[PDB]
């Protein structure tokens, strides 16, 4: 609707960073070495960043647009377009604070 006229840049608070994220990444696992599917809680988890293919959960129980905006109870993957995987971010909860190197060096 409205047109983009200005672009603002500012610091992101921890609250805002957590608001961006769709889930916390707790494991460094990327994918399964045998099934080649993303590992749960990993860097490529479907339950966080979205489904790999459009309108299909991880468990393969919902596979059509009819159940759009839904979250499968078996797997937790939202049934939506897979392009959201380019737009959904995660977050890591640091045990101790870490300074941003840009504002130090």
């Amino acid at each position: 609707k409205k047109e983009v006229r200005k672009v603002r840049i500012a610091l992101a608070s921890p609250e805002k960073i957590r608001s961006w994220s769709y889930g916390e990444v707790e494991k460094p696992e990327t994918i399964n070495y045998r099934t080649l599917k993303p590992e749960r809680d990993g860097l490529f988890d479907e339950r966080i960043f979205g489904p790999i293919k459009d309108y299909e959960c991880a468990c393969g129980k919902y596979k059509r647009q009819r159940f759009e905006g839904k979250v499968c109870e078996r797997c937790g993957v939202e049934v939506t377009k897979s392009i959201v995987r380019r737009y959904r971010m995660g977050h890591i909860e640091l045990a101790t604070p870490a300074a941003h190197i840009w504002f130090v060096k």
Binding site: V4, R5, K6, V7, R8, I9, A10, L11, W102, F103
Partner: protein
């Protein structure tokens, strides 16, 4: 005050062009701390956002021109001023 082309370009008001020229880290950190807002006045910002540049046929002086033939113009004026 007098300054060179590099220093004058890096000290511009829009952070997008300054970040896309040089010293990306410094420009971005100074803009983020100050919460700078870019008004998209120049050409590089519009190129980055893929918008219509404010020059040539994209300038406000000529962009809103309207073209209309005799018959339709007469119709529009007659069917309204008749009231």
């Amino acid at each position: 005050l007098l300054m060179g082309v590099t220093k004058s370009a890096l000290s511009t008001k829009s952070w997008l062009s300054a970040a896309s020229f040089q010293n990306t880290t410094h420009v971005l950190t100074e803009a983020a701390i100050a919460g700078k807002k870019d008004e998209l006045i120049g050409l590089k910002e519009n190129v980055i956002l893929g918008r219509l540049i404010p020059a040539g046929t994209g300038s406000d002086f000529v962009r809103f021109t309207q073209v209309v033939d005799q018959k339709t113009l007469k119709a529009i004026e007659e069917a309204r001023k008749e009231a």
